[PDB]
Symmetry: C3
Subunit: 78 residues, 3 copies
């Protein structure tokens, strides 16, 4: 099935996460906020991959990321 | 029980979805983004209805909608 | 485990909820909207506390709050 990622990432590191998610085939949506918030539905078995991306891009290096992995009952694509 | 809809819809079609959701008694919230993102808690047995609305308003006609249906453990109304 | 709160609160009462959540050790994120929308992952056994806060701050006194409590499969903190 599928999952929903809500990754709260720092704004300075938002630019590069946004670019690098694209390069890893991750379709994501940025909710503007000032500390930017991302939304990304990924496959059940691609959770470890996206978490790696978010960590390599942002976190305590300075930095800091907090992400939630949430269940999805249904996915539709019109 | 209840569900949560996260419908990522195109901005040109956001205006009309926003209006038409009201006409179908769907209380929804628009998170501004440029590709706008909607949030809408609907009843367990009104998922098919709202999906119809979103499709009739937006999708590949040009267009394109992507929606997630997510479980809700509790709903409160103060 | 943990939960995710999506609290749709009125804008006039958003300022004070935002301040008072901090005073109760609730790390939350505000998604700008005009009727503002909040996001807050809290512990499994701190749902009653945050609901109290939201009610004391906003609701029908004038007012009005609507909140969803949603399951979280995984929480990560980089």
């Amino acid at each position: 099935h599928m999952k929903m990622i809500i990754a709260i990432v720092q704004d300075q590191d938002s630019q590069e996460l946004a670019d690098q998610l694209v390069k890893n085939n991750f379709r994501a949506t940025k909710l503007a906020t000032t500390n930017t918030t991302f939304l990304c539905g990924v496959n059940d078995d691609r959770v470890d991959e996206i978490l790696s991306v978010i960590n390599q891009t942002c976190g305590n290096r300075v930095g800091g990321a907090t992400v939630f992995v949430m269940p999805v009952d249904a996915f539709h694509q019109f």
